[PDB]
Structure formats: C-alpha cells, structure tokens
Design an enzyme around this catalytic site. Structure first.
Site, PDB file in Angstrom:
ATOM      1  N   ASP A 142       0.720  -1.481  -0.062  1.00  0.00           N
ATOM      2  CA  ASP A 142       0.151  -0.303  -0.471  1.00  0.00           C
ATOM      3  C   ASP A 142       1.041   1.215  -0.261  1.00  0.00           C
ATOM      4  O   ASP A 142       2.123   1.450  -0.129  1.00  0.00           O
ATOM      5  CB  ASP A 142      -0.767   0.101   1.149  1.00  0.00           C
ATOM      6  CG  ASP A 142      -2.229  -1.036   1.438  1.00  0.00           C
ATOM      7  OD1 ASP A 142      -1.915  -2.173   0.320  1.00  0.00           O
ATOM      8  OD2 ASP A 142      -3.217  -0.707   1.967  1.00  0.00           O
ATOM      9  N   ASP A 153      -4.352  -3.853   6.019  1.00  0.00           N
ATOM     10  CA  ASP A 153      -4.284  -3.456   7.019  1.00  0.00           C
ATOM     11  C   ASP A 153      -6.084  -3.501   7.605  1.00  0.00           C
ATOM     12  O   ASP A 153      -6.028  -2.942   8.527  1.00  0.00           O
ATOM     13  CB  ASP A 153      -3.569  -2.111   7.539  1.00  0.00           C
ATOM     14  CG  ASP A 153      -4.545  -0.986   6.195  1.00  0.00           C
ATOM     15  OD1 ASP A 153      -5.194  -0.611   6.549  1.00  0.00           O
ATOM     16  OD2 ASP A 153      -3.294  -0.743   5.317  1.00  0.00           O
ATOM     17  N   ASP A 212      -9.309  -6.063   3.303  1.00  0.00           N
ATOM     18  CA  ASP A 212      -8.230  -6.789   2.549  1.00  0.00           C
ATOM     19  C   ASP A 212      -7.904  -8.108   3.400  1.00  0.00           C
ATOM     20  O   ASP A 212      -7.030  -8.997   2.648  1.00  0.00           O
ATOM     21  CB  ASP A 212      -7.208  -5.469   3.202  1.00  0.00           C
ATOM     22  CG  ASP A 212      -7.284  -4.918   2.372  1.00  0.00           C
ATOM     23  OD1 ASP A 212      -7.538  -4.260   1.771  1.00  0.00           O
ATOM     24  OD2 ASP A 212      -6.581  -3.594   3.021  1.00  0.00           O
TER      25      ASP A 212
HETATM   26  N1  LIG Z   1     -11.462  11.915   7.377  1.00  0.00           N
HETATM   27  C1  LIG Z   1     -12.065  12.753   6.577  1.00  0.00           C
HETATM   28  N2  LIG Z   1     -13.336  12.927   5.656  1.00  0.00           N
HETATM   29  C2  LIG Z   1     -12.736  13.008   4.609  1.00  0.00           C
HETATM   30  N3  LIG Z   1     -12.155  12.594   4.105  1.00  0.00           N
HETATM   31  C3  LIG Z   1     -10.916  12.487   4.766  1.00  0.00           C
HETATM   32  C4  LIG Z   1     -11.192  11.865   5.420  1.00  0.00           C
HETATM   33  N4  LIG Z   1      -9.351  11.009   5.746  1.00  0.00           N
HETATM   34  C5  LIG Z   1      -8.801  10.421   4.756  1.00  0.00           C
HETATM   35  N5  LIG Z   1      -9.999  11.387   3.934  1.00  0.00           N
HETATM   36  C6  LIG Z   1      -9.477  11.524   2.358  1.00  0.00           C
HETATM   37  O1  LIG Z   1      -8.549  10.455   2.207  1.00  0.00           O
HETATM   38  C7  LIG Z   1      -6.964  11.035   1.217  1.00  0.00           C
HETATM   39  C8  LIG Z   1      -5.805  10.065   1.956  1.00  0.00           C
HETATM   40  O2  LIG Z   1      -6.048   8.842   1.107  1.00  0.00           O
HETATM   41  P1  LIG Z   1      -6.010   7.736   2.183  1.00  0.00           P
HETATM   42  O3  LIG Z   1      -4.382   7.590   2.770  1.00  0.00           O
HETATM   43  O4  LIG Z   1      -6.812   6.943   3.316  1.00  0.00           O
HETATM   44  O5  LIG Z   1      -6.173   5.774   1.046  1.00  0.00           O
HETATM   45  P2  LIG Z   1      -5.458   4.908   2.024  1.00  0.00           P
HETATM   46  O6  LIG Z   1      -4.389   4.148   2.039  1.00  0.00           O
HETATM   47  O7  LIG Z   1      -6.456   4.256   2.725  1.00  0.00           O
HETATM   48  C9  LIG Z   1      -5.459   3.395   0.131  1.00  0.00           C
HETATM   49  P3  LIG Z   1      -5.381   1.890   0.813  1.00  0.00           P
HETATM   50  O8  LIG Z   1      -6.233   1.775   1.487  1.00  0.00           O
HETATM   51  O9  LIG Z   1      -5.945   0.991  -0.446  1.00  0.00           O
HETATM   52  O10 LIG Z   1      -3.505   1.935   0.986  1.00  0.00           O
HETATM   53  C10 LIG Z   1      -7.582  11.920   1.037  1.00  0.00           C
HETATM   54  O11 LIG Z   1      -7.547  12.556  -0.092  1.00  0.00           O
HETATM   55  C11 LIG Z   1      -8.603  12.844   1.824  1.00  0.00           C
HETATM   56  O12 LIG Z   1      -9.483  13.479   0.727  1.00  0.00           O
END
Ligand SMILES: Nc1ncnc2c1ncn2[C@@H]1O[C@H](COP(=O)(O)OP(=O)(O)CP(=O)(O)O)[C@@H](O)[C@H]1O
Ligand SMILES: CCCCCCCC/C=C/CCCCCCCC(=O)OC[C@H](COP(=O)(O)OCC[N+](C)(C)C)OC(=O)CCCCCCC/C=C/CCCCCCCC
Ligand SMILES: CCCCCCCC/C=C\CCCCCCCC(=O)OC[C@H](COP(=O)(O)OCC[N+](C)(C)C)OC(=O)CCCCCCC/C=C\CCCCCCCC
Ligand SMILES: CC(C)CCC[C@@H](C)[C@H]1CC[C@H]2[C@@H]3CC=C4C[C@@H](O)CC[C@]4(C)[C@H]3CC[C@]12C
Ligand SMILES: *[C@@H]1O[C@H](CO)[C@@H](O)[C@H](O)[C@H]1NC(C)=O
Ligand code: NA
Ligand code: NA
Lengths: 272, 976
Positions: B328, B669, B673
C-alpha cells in the site's frame, strides 16, 4: 552436451592427477626420513616376544603316538624351519662365522651404516639340540609320548639381551646366557607335567648372548637365531596340560594383555 | 454440514425455517431440546494426537529406517562371527550405541516441535473476549453455552458476539461493517445482518437468532469433526525428504556395486555385511534435525528483532522465496504524518510552512475568499486535541482521528483561534462518518444566523469526486457556475499539486432555504431528504505525505534481488505515479504509454504498447478486463501501479499474480483486505495501524508499520537456505573418507586404515557441534543480489553440492588421512609397499612372529596395537582436515578475508569441541586401550596439517574465479 562433456571430463583428469601427484609427492617425502637399516621407533617390538616353532594353531598340542598322522603336521613343520639350520646349508664361509661352543659376550659387528657392507652371521649347529635336532630321530619325539618344542626369541633389530644379575639354574653362566624355564601353569599342571629336559648350546638352558645384536635383514641376511629345544620326556597320558615358558632378564618385559611377550603358553595333550 | 446459510428469507419464514421467534424466543421445554440437538458453542484447541502414534512415527522415520536396517545387519554380523567361535564383542558396543543414537534422536525430536511450538505459541494476537451477556427478552444473565437456535440474544458493544447469529433487530451496529435488520448481501460474511462468533462488537444494541452451532458454523466447519487439517509439509520438510531419498539412493548403489564385486571375487559374507553397516553409519547425517530446528528458531528470533513478527512456520520458510509484493501507499510506504504546505483558492497556489512555522500565514487573513475557506475548514474538521496535555506544542498533541484530520487541525489551530466555540454555535444534529467506500464525511448543522435557514451541510472528500458532484466554483465571495475556465483550472491545479507527491481534499457547504424546509425536520441517513448536490465548493487543501526514510533503499534492494513491487493504492493515477517515482517503484528512465505518447506528441492508440515498461492503471480499467487481460498486463509490463483501485480488488490482483508461478506477499490493514490477506502466500498485517481481523488472517505481522521490514524479512528468510546448504555440505564432506578406507582394505589387502567404531565417533563428535555452528553464520554480500528461489526448479541439495562434497573435498580428506596412516606404519617398521596383501597374515591370531621390512618379528597383540594407533591417526587426520572444512564452508562465494574469521564466534566453539574430543579420545581413552584408541605421538597430529592448508587454498581459488568470472562455465559448473 556432446562438446561440453570434454571440458568436464578434462577438469577431473587434471584434478585427480594433481591429487595423485600430491599424495605420491608427500609419501616419497615422508619416506626420505625413513632409514633402510634401522627402524625409526622400537615401541611395539622393543620387548621381544618368545614363541615356539611348531606353529601350533590354538595353543594346543594334541596328537596320538600310534597314529602317524595326528602329529604329521607337527613333525613336518619343525623340519621346514630346521632345514635352514642344516649343517649342509651353513658350509659357506663368506657369510657364516664359526663362534665358540661356549657362551660369550655379545658380538658387535660394527655400526648401522654401509661400512663393511654385508655382515657375517654366527652359525648355529643342530647337534646341540640333542634328541631334538632330527639328526638321529626323524620324528622329533612325537613318535613316543615325548613332545619336543623349540623355543626362539623374536628378532629385534639392535637388541642386546641382559640376563638377570625364580630358582637359580645351578649352571648359572648368567654373564652370557639368557635363562629360559618351562613349568606348568597351574598346580594341577605342575604336578602332572613330569620331567622337562632342555637342549641348548653348550648344555646351558637359554639363548647365548653372542648371537646379538641382530642387524636387520640387509646387513645380516642368512641370520640364524639361537634355539632352545624343550622335551617333555614323561608327562601324564590322555590329559590336557598347560605349560608356560618364560625368558628372564632386565631387558625382557612381561605384559598382562600380550600373552606372547617374553612368555608363551602351550597346552600339550598326548593321547593313547 | 451444509454450504449454504439461510439469510434471504424474511423474519416470518426465518422463524419457520429453524423454529424460532423474533421477540420471545422459545420456552424452556423447546430451547433445552434444541440445545441438546445442537450442543455447546465454544472455541477450544484440545484436539491432539493420542501421541502413541506420534512416538511411533518419530521412532522410525526418514533416516531411522536405514539405521535400524544397519543395526539388524550388525546383530546378524555378530551372530555370524559367533558361529566361527570367535567373539571380540566389538559389534555389541557398536550395535548398542547405534540403537542409543536412535533413542537420543527420538528424545531430541520430542524436544523439537515443543520449544518451537513454545516459540510458535508466542506469535498470536488476542481480542478482548467475554461470553457473558444479558438477553432473551426478559433481562436475565444467560451463559453463552445456553445459546442455541430458537433463542434471541441482545448484545451490547465492547465485546465479542456470543454466537453465530442472524441479526433481526439492531440500531446502527458496527463490526470490524454496518449491521442492520434488512438483508443486504448474499455472502454471509458481508450480509450485514449476521453476527460472527469471536468477532468484536464496537457499539450499539443488536438482537439476533442463532443459526449455527459447532460444526454447523462457518468458522468451525470440521473443527469438532477431528480429521487432519494443517498437516501440509513445509518446504524444508520436502527438501529433507529429497535429501533422504538421495542419501538412500547413494548408499544403495554403493552397497549393490560392492556386493556384486564381492560375490564373484571371493569375499566372504562377513566382510560384505560389515561394509554395508559401515556405509549405513557413514552416509547418514544424524545431527541434522537438531541443526534444522535450531536454524528456524534463530531466524524467527532474528526477524522478531527486525520488527518481523512471523507467526506460522510455513511463513518463515516461504518468506525467502517471495517474488511479488503488493504493498500500500499510506502506511507501509509513507510516514503517515501529513503536513499542510500548499493552499489553492481563486485559481492560485499559496505555500505554507510545513513545520516549525511559529508565525501566522504570509497571505492576508482578511480576504473574503480566505475567511469562508478557513471557517469551513475549522468547522468541517473532526479532530480533537489530547485532553490533559495542553502544555506541549500543537504537534505533540495526539488525535484518535485520521492523520489528515490531524493535519487540518494543526493548520487551523496555528492559523485561526478557538474552534470549539464555532462548532458549538453550528449545532450538529447528524454526521456521516468518513469511510473508504463513500470517501466523504457528510455533516448536518443547524444555522444560527438571523436568516433562519436552519440547515447547513458541510462535507470533505476527494477533490475529483467532489467537483464531479459540484456544478459551481467560488471566487472573491461571489458564486458563479463552473465553466470550462474553472474545470480546466481545477485540473491543472490538481496536476501541479500532485506532481510533487501530495494528496488534496475538497470542501463544500450549503444552506437550505427556509420556505422549502420548515424549522422542524427529521434527518435520516438512508433517506435523501436534504439535497447533496450542487454545493458551494470553496478551495483545496494540499498536504505532504513524505515516504519513510528506509523505503527507497528497500525498493532498490527489491530491484537488485529480482522482487517485483506493486502498489495497490486507491488514489489518482497521477499522485500514485508521482510518489512511486519518488520511492523508486517506477524507476527512472521508465515511461508509461501515456507519457511516451506525450513525448511522441501523438495519441496513445498510435503508440506501440511494447515501447512502455510501466503501467498506471485505474481501478475501473482492470474492472473492465477479463482475467486473461490482467494476466497479460502482469506479464508484459514490469512496474505496475494499481491506482484508484477498490480495496476488494486486491482479491483480483493477488489471484491474477499467483497464476504466474510466483509467490506473492500482499500487505493489508483492513477487514476488507482479509480475503486477499488469506489468498496470498504470505499475507501481511500492518503493525501499529492495523485491525485484528487482518492480524488474524495474515501469515506475518509487522511491528514497525514500515516498509524495509518486508525486505529484511526476505533477507533472513533467504539466510535459512543459505545456512542449510552450508550445514548439509560440511556433514556430507566426511562421508567418502570413512568408507574409502574399507574399500582399500578389501581390495588391496592393507591392514584396516580405520575401524567401524571410529567412523561413528567421527560423526558423533566432530560432525554435530560444528554442524550447529554453521547455522549462526551471517549473511553474504550477494544474498540480496540473487533471484528469488523457485520451489520446484531449485532444491536444497542439488547435484553440484553432493558432487563437490563427495568427489572434491571428500577425496582430499582421504589422501591426507592415508598419509598419516602410512607414516604411522612406516616409522615402526612396515614400509608402504610391505602392507599390500598383508591383512590375511596380519589378522591371524596364531602368527606371533610376523616379519616386517627390517626383519624383526611382531607378536599378534603388538600388530593389533599398531593397527589401533593407525586408526587413531586416521581419526585425528580427519579432525584437522575438517577444521579447514568448516572455515571454507562458511561461504559459497566470498572469502574469509571479507567475512571475517572471528566475526562468528560459534565456529571457534565448534573447533574447540573437535580438538577437545580428539584429545580426550586418544589420551584419555587411549591410556587404557579401549574402543580402538591408543595414545598418539606429538608428530602424528601435524602430519595432516599440510593437507588441511590445501583444502582451504583450493576452495579459496575456486571461489576467486567465481567472483572474478561470473557466468563463464566456472560459475556454471563449479558452484555449489
Ligand atoms: N476524515 C476524513 N473525512 C473525509 N475525507 C477523508 C478523511 N480522511 C481521509 N480522507 C480522504 O482520504 C484521502 C487520503 O487517502 P488515504 O491515505 O486514506 O488512502 P488509503 O491509504 O486508505 C488507500 P489504501 O488503503 O488501499 O492503501 C484524502 O484525499 C482525503 O480526502
Ligand atoms: C579412492 C581412494 C582414495 C584414497 C587412496 C589412497 C591410496 C590408497 C592405496 C593404497 C595401495 C598401496 C599404496 C602404496 C603406496 C606406495 C608409495 C610408493 O610410492 O612406494 C614406492 C615403492 C617403493 O617404496 P618402499 O616401500 O621401497 O619404500 C620404503 C622406504 N625406503 C625408500 C627407505 C626404502 O616402489 C615400488 O615398490 C614399486 C613396486 C610396487 C608399485 C606399487 C604402486 C602402487 C601405487 C599406488 C598409488 C595410487 C595413487 C591413488 C591416488 C588416487 C587419487 C584419486
Ligand atoms: C605453516 C604452519 C605449520 C605447517 C607445518 C607443516 C609440517 C607439519 C608436519 C610435521 C611437523 C611436525 C612438528 C612436530 C614434530 C616434533 C618431533 C619431530 O621433530 O619429528 C620429526 C619427524 C621425524 O622424526 P625423527 O626421524 O627426527 O625422529 C628420530 C627419533 N630417533 C632419533 C629415536 C630415531 O618427521 C616426521 O614424522 C615425518 C613428517 C612427514 C610430513 C610430510 C609432509 C609433506 C608436506 C610437505
Ligand atoms: C570419479 C571420476 C572417474 C568421475 C568421472 C565422471 C565425472 C567427471 C562425471 C560423472 C557424473 C557427472 C555429473 C552428472 C550430472 C551433473 C549435473 C549437471 O547439472 C551438470 C553436470 C554434472 C555436475 C556432471 C559433472 C561431471 C560428472 C561428475
Ligand atoms: C635322549 O637323550 C638321552 C641322553 O641325554 C639318551 O640316553 C636317549 O637315548 C635319548 N632318547 C632319544 C629318543 O633319542
Ligand atoms: Na557425515
Ligand atoms: Na563430516
């Protein structure tokens, strides 16, 4: 493949020809420290053993006088060894030296090197072995109930026996005679052994010291050991009798694990 | 039982299917009968073997059958010898010690899978578990053992579900997954109305009916049905089976060749029979299970120290063979500590201080555009500071919310004033928590302004989806429709703000008219009610997500070691690509098809796809392909970034990757998944920031929540196979130098170079401790420059290893022993060429005047003592030729000048053990001649040293050309 096998069959030719050349190139290096005249160490043969000539198999002499074939091997094996002591095989004077008929000091023939080359042996005469030389009786005593063994001390290169300074022989001559005494091993064998008659050089029951030291198959080929012949002229019939013969001295050693070091044990049985 | 769960039916017929009631449950007379029909519902591990079959299986297994055959041969040899009326009793001791060896290996095996199990038992994760709840209509305390079909249970958050139930009454319950009273999904795992046994309940009150108990449960299945599940052979078990087969084949071939030689050449049966037992005691590695179970425990401890909490054993064995990693972005590849640095509003780019600002913003705070944006940012945020610690700076204050929320809180508190008062003024009635599926955090506020709008809705989320649902943009406090000059401006701003590798968020607000919506209203999550479209987008927040420091080194080591790395982030294919290029996943001088089309200044379809090596494919892109297209994408393209992908599509990614004869290691995590964390060969659960479902479904758990742990797990998973090839080679080296002496004794007639007890003392003393000492060796320099090992094509013991152990070093340990043997015999009188065809006269107990090369005459016991000394010299020679056979086996490509002779200090313990055993056996057991040992002169120790300073030189110059000339028929042929 068809062409790369020649490159794998060629490495193992050179590698295994190099291993062989290193093994042979180290054996001939070790052998450069090994003399052709005397052994580097005398640790296992230093205290000489003492053995009998009939080369009897299981420390048992068993035969029957009325059966010419029970003692056939016993009589025929003494002849093979006594053939080299025949008076006709000692006539040459370029090799043999005539010592006296009385024991004397050890005869030093030089040093362990190539000076004087071949060395002169001292001749041994059969007729000293009365009743056991075979010059009169073709069978060495086995025709009757009188077995006759011939005792010999194992050859040790450069070894000079020292006689002691048991019972006194009453014909001592210890300065130049190494005593040998055969007696029954047990009380019930001492009571049954009967009479034992020794036949040695000059009437002395032992190995004269004038045949020592031995010089080792290269300086002294055609070397004749001193022999002591033991005859049991009267022993119990139809019985297994244990007899132990010992050579006495301060060079001579005895061991509790080596049954033939300075001693031997022979079981004589005469059947009727 | 059955593969289907009854959940499609409604409550009326769900009552009929299993005879239950929604409200009152069932009376005692029926509930007791149903409980007796089904039985208890609990999770216990108590099933285990009767252990008598286990002692029998450990009693004879693998090498034990050969050694039992050898013991039987030894007993037969003794009885045959006794037939000849001779009994030296040397066979009694040999057979007794040989059987004792199997008894001790059984004891050591009972020690095995017990200390390893104790190490295994420590690698496990709990969840707060309890089985007490008050339920069944009338408020009574009922044990979980009484829960059965027909009984309704009311549960409360903060514990685990007492039984596998189907929820009928619930009020917004959440599990780690929404819980409702309506059928949602066909799959019972995600049907949203079924409770799972031993699964946490977050909050809320839910009521359900038990549908399964014991074996009927999905989790249980055949848990109470006994049978054997999990007995699959570990890879090292397969390698050991192959090694046993190879050893048995070699021993059988040698024995058959010798027997066919001896049958026609007049060798009596005793010699052949004693040669078979010599071969059996020689070519059998006894101390191998000990050094095998030591290595796995040592590597498990090493990885546990390297933050790599490997739980299963198949995981630690299979980790070193990893080929594909699907990691990730946030979490594993980034510090997950975002800092706000850039701002966007009025189509302009505003910078800000990342940290240690200690001052207000450079831009004016009185701007009409900035005022509304700041107010909405403060209002829309949900993060709260750590209570009781309002003395530390803003950064040190902790939030249990999302890291992005901490970022906006850090920005707002250092830019604006108090936010609690503003939130209190804007009273909040309902709020939708942020989730990955929706990707927005909707909130409901009541307007306190003089104009009684009474309804304020503010949410934040991904800017692309935010503007896709928006039809207007806000500039200088005046609303205007979203024209092309605004959409293209937003696109360009997003590209610029994603080029440096930062994620951005959108913000919106709206006030509902009072005429359409009265003062009193009821808000429902399911019902649309208030409109959620055409809101007032204001601006963008840019926040930096820097990758962790050690990540680029790990990604470079993966490239060097031939391990493919894949990203499965759910972000825009621009930001994902821009951060992959920074972390090294998309290396330099690599170009996706879009970028090469841009460079060619033509359309994408007019560009040959082979001209591109990278791939940044969105989630819908692989959603639209059949599995064949996914397989060809994973085959043709090297670096692939699965951006904008659904968390569930990790299933598709992993199952497509596994169809390429490769070992995948996905890192997830979330509970989403977990199905993908189970299909993967090595599922990985994120360490600090992770869910217990993932940590239960993963084969390996991190403890540093960081990349470069997944690669330092591989680097020590490879060490197992590197140190096993060094332990199975040193053992096999001294195996032909223990049976060659008897072959020459039979053929050439030399007196016995070495006895039968001596070649067993060699295996017992100088083959065990030095064997274990090679399992503590450190890694090579080429361990991370080697391609991943193939499970089927590559073997632990290949042909070259055995050929080099037997035909190269084993033949140099015999020529060195024979030199000392000939030295011992020649210095006492018997010259080397005088010993040929002498065994018949040597071993005759009646010849007490055997004549040596100097004319002297030897009695039988003195010849026996000299033979014992000659065998002791052979034993000492192969104790010193195996000291330079343990130094040169610490490496397979490097030299000791680089590895270091004193860096591994257990090699010195193994050497000292060899020397001490050899000194005890010749001066303590040779003072009283016993077991064919005698005191040895001081020269006979150093005679074999020149042949030991040859085995080392040969191996050093063998590895020197391997290092100098890679792939030059030398690396191809002479490399074990
Ligand atoms: N409390 C909240 N309210 C609204 N939007 C949120 C938020 N927390 C995160 N986000 C949104 O999530 C995005 C951040 O992405 P994030 O780092 O969560 O990807 P991810 O790590 O979950 C993908 P993966 O899990 O597959 O690795 C930001 O663009 C933001 O707009
Ligand atoms: C797979 C097995 C691997 C391990 C094998 C190790 C070797 C085991 C073989 C044993 C067989 C007997 C070996 C005998 C070695 C003789 C060494 C030699 O060279 O003695 C030369 C002899 C003369 O010596 P001497 O007794 O008079 O010296 C006495 C001292 N002084 C010089 C003072 C008089 O000359 C002569 O007698 C000539 C007449 C006799 C010729 C015999 C030739 C035998 C040679 C064998 C070499 C084989 C090498 C194998 C290598 C395999 C590698 C893979
Ligand atoms: C660089 C690191 C060290 C490397 C050392 C390599 C060499 C090691 C080999 C041997 C050295 C041994 C050292 C200790 C020896 C102490 C005793 C000694 O000095 O013993 C030398 C012996 C010969 O003893 P001697 O004849 O003098 O005894 C005569 C006795 N009296 C007088 C009663 C007849 O040499 C022998 O054993 C024969 C030895 C044959 C060795 C062949 C090796 C071929 C390789 C080249
Ligand atoms: C003892 C002497 C006479 C042996 C002579 C035959 C030798 C050179 C032959 C016999 C068997 C052969 C091996 C058989 C199989 C393998 C595995 C293969 O992947 C590479 C070649 C290799 C490693 C061969 C090397 C050469 C080899 C060891
Ligand atoms: C044995 O020797 C004695 C003289 O010592 C002699 O009288 C006797 O005849 C001899 N016996 C034999 C069988 O020669
Ligand atoms: Na071995
Ligand atoms: Na060994």
């Amino acid at each position: 493949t068809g062409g790369s096998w020649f490159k794998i069959l060629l490495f193992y030719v050179i590698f295994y020809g190099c291993l062989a050349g290193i093994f042979i190139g180290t054996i001939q290096v070790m052998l450069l420290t090994i003399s052709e005249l005397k052994p580097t160490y005398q640790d296992r043969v230093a205290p000489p053993g003492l053995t009998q000539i009939p080369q009897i198999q299981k420390t048992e002499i068993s035969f029957r006088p009325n059966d010419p074939k029970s003692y056939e091997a016993y009589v025929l094996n003494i002849i093979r060894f006594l053939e080299k002591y025949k008076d006709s095989a000692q006539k040459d004077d370029m090799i043999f030296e005539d010592c006296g008929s009385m024991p004397s000091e050890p005869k030093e023939r030089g040093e362990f090197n190539h000076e004087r080359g071949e060395r002169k042996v001292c001749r041994f005469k059969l007729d000293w072995l009365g009743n056991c030389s075979g010059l009169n009786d073709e069978s060495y005593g086995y025709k009757e109930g009188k077995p006759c063994i011939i005792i010999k001390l194992n050859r040790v290169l450069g070894f000079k026996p020292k006689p002691p300074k048991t019972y006194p022989l009453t014909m001592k001559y210890n300065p130049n005679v190494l005593p040998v005494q055969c007696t029954g091993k047990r009380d019930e064998d001492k009571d049954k052994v009967g009479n034992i008659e020794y036949f040695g050089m000059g009437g002395f029951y032992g190995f004269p010291l004038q045949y020592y030291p031995y010089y080792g198959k290269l300086l002294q080929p055609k070397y004749l050991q001193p022999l002591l012949a033991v005859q049991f002229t009267n022993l119990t019939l139809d019985t297994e009798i244990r007899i132990e013969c010992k050579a006495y001295g301060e060079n001579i050693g005895y061991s509790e694990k080596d049954r033939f070091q300075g001693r031997f044990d022979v079981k004589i049985e005469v059947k009727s | 039982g059955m593969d289907l769960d009854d959940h499609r039916l409604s409550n009326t017929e769900l009552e009929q299917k299993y005879g239950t009631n929604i409200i009152q449950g069932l009376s005692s007379v029926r509930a007791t009968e149903l409980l007796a029909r089904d039985g208890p519902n609990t999770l216990t591990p108590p099933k285990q073997t009767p252990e008598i079959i286990k002692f029998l299986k450990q009693m004879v297994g693998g090498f034990s059958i050969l050694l039992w055959i050898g013991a039987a041969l030894c007993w037969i040899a003794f009885v045959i010898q006794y037939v000849n009326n001779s009994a030296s009793l040397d066979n009694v001791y040999l057979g007794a010690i040989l059987v004792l060896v199997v008894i001790l290996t059984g004891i050591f095996a009972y020690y095995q899978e017990a200390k390893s199990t104790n190490i295994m038992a420590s690698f496990s994760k709990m969840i707060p578990q309890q089985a007490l709840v008050i339920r069944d209509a009338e408020k009574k305390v009922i044990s979980a053992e009484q829960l059965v079909v027909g009984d309704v249970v009311e549960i409360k958050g903060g514990d685990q579900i007492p039984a596998d139930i189907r929820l009928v009454f619930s009020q917004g319950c959440k599990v780690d997954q929404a819980r409702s009273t309506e059928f949602t999904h066909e799959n019972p795992l995600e049907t949203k109305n079924i409770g799972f046994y031993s699964t946490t309940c977050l909050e809320g009150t839910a009521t359900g009916i038990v549908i399964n108990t014991g074996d009927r449960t999905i989790i249980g299945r055949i848990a109470s049905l006994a049978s054997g599940v999990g007995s699959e052979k570990t890879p090292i078990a397969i390698e050991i089976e192959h090694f046993v087969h190879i050893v048995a084949g070699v021993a059988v071939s040698i024995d058959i060749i010798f027997f066919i030689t001896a049958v026609c050449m007049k060798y009596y049966v005793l010699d052949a029979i004693i040669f078979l037992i010599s071969i059996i005691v020689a070519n059998v590695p006894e101390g191998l299970l000990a050094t095998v179970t030591v290595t796995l425990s040592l590597t498990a401890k090493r990885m546990a120290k390297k933050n790599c909490l490997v739980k299963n054993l198949e995981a630690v064995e299979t980790l070193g063979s990893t080929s594909i990693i699907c990691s990730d972005k946030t979490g594993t590849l980034t510090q997950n500590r975002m800092t706000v640095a850039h701002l966007w509003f009025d189509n302009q780019i505003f910078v800000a201080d990342t940290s240690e600002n200690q001052t207000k913003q450079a831009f004016d705070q009185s701007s009409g555009t900035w005022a509304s944006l700041s107010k909405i940012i403060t209002l829309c945020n949900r993060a709260e500071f750590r209570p009781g610690q309002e003395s530390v700076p803003i950064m040190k204050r902790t939030v249990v919310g999302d890291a992005s929320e901490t970022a906006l809180l850090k920005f707002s508190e250092v830019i604006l004033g108090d936010v609690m008062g503003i939130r209190k003024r804007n009273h909040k009635v309902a709020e939708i928590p942020f989730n990955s599926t929706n990707k927005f955090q909707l909130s409901i506020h009541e307007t306190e302004d003089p104009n009684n709008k009474r309804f304020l809705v503010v949410m934040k989320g991904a800017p692309e989806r935010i503007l896709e649902k928006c039809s207007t943009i806000m500039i200088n406090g005046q609303e205007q429709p979203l024209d092309k000059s605004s959409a293209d401006s937003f696109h360009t701003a997003y590209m610029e703000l994603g080029g440096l590798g930062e994620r951005v968020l959108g913000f919106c607000h709206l006030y509902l008219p009072a005429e359409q919506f009265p003062q009193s209203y009821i808000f429902d999550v399911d019902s649309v009610n208030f409109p959620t479209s055409n809101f007032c987008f204001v601006g963008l927040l840019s926040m930096i997500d820097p990758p962790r420091s050690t990540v680029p080194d790990a990604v470079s080591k993966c490239r060097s070691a031939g391990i493919k790395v894949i990203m499965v982030t759910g972000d825009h294919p621009i930001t994902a690509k821009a951060i992959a290029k920074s972390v090294g996943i998309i290396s330099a001088n690599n170009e996706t098809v879009e970028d090469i089309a841009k460079r060619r200044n033509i359309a994408v379809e007019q560009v040959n796809k082979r001209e591109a090596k990278a791939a940044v494919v969105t989630g819908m892109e692989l959603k639209d392909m059949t599995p064949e297209q996914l397989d060809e994408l994973l085959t043709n393209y090297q670096e692939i970034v699965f951006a904008r992908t659904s968390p569930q599509q990790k299933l598709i990614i992993v199952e497509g990757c596994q169809r390429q004869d490769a070992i995948v290691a996905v890192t997830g995590d979330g509970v989403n998944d977990s199905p993908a964390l189970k299909k993967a060969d090595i599922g990985i659960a994120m360490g600090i920031a992770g869910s217990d479902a993932a940590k239960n479904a993963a084969d390996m758990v991190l403890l540093d929540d960081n990349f470069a742990s997944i690669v330092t797990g591989v680097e020590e998973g490879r060490l197992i196979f590197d140190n096993l090839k060094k332990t199975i080679a040193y053992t096999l080296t001294a195996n032909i130098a223990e049976l060659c002496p008897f072959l020459i004794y039979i053929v050439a007639g030399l007196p016995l170079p070495i006895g039968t007890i001596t070649i067993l003392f060699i295996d017992l003393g100088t083959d065990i401790i030095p064997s274990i000492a090679l399992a503590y060796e450190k890694a090579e320099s080429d361990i991370m420059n080697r391609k991943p090992r193939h499970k089927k094509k590559d073997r632990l013991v290949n042909t070259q290893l055995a050929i080099y152990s037997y035909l190269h070093i084993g033949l140099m340990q015999a020529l060195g022993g024979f030199l000392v043997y000939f030295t011992v015999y020649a210095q006492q009188g018997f010259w080397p060429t005088s010993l040929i065809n002498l065994r018949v006269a040597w071993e005759t107990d009646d010849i007490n005047d055997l004549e040596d090369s100097y004319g002297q005459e030897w009695t039988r016991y003195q010849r026996k003592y000299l033979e014992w000394t000659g065998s002791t010299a052979f034993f000492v020679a192969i104790m010193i030729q195996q000291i330079a056979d343990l130094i040169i086996r610490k490496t397979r490509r490097n030299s000791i000048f680089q590895q270091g002779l004193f860096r591994n200090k257990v090699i010195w313990v193994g050497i000292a053990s060899q020397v001490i055993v050899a000194l005890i056996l010749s001066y303590g057991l040779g003072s009283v001649p016993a077991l064919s040992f005698t005191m040895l002169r001081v020269q006979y120790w150093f005679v074999a040293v020149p042949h030991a300073i040859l085995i080392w030189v040969y191996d050093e110059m063998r590895k020197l050309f391997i290092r100098l000339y890679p792939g030059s028929w030398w690396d191809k042929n002479m490399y074990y």
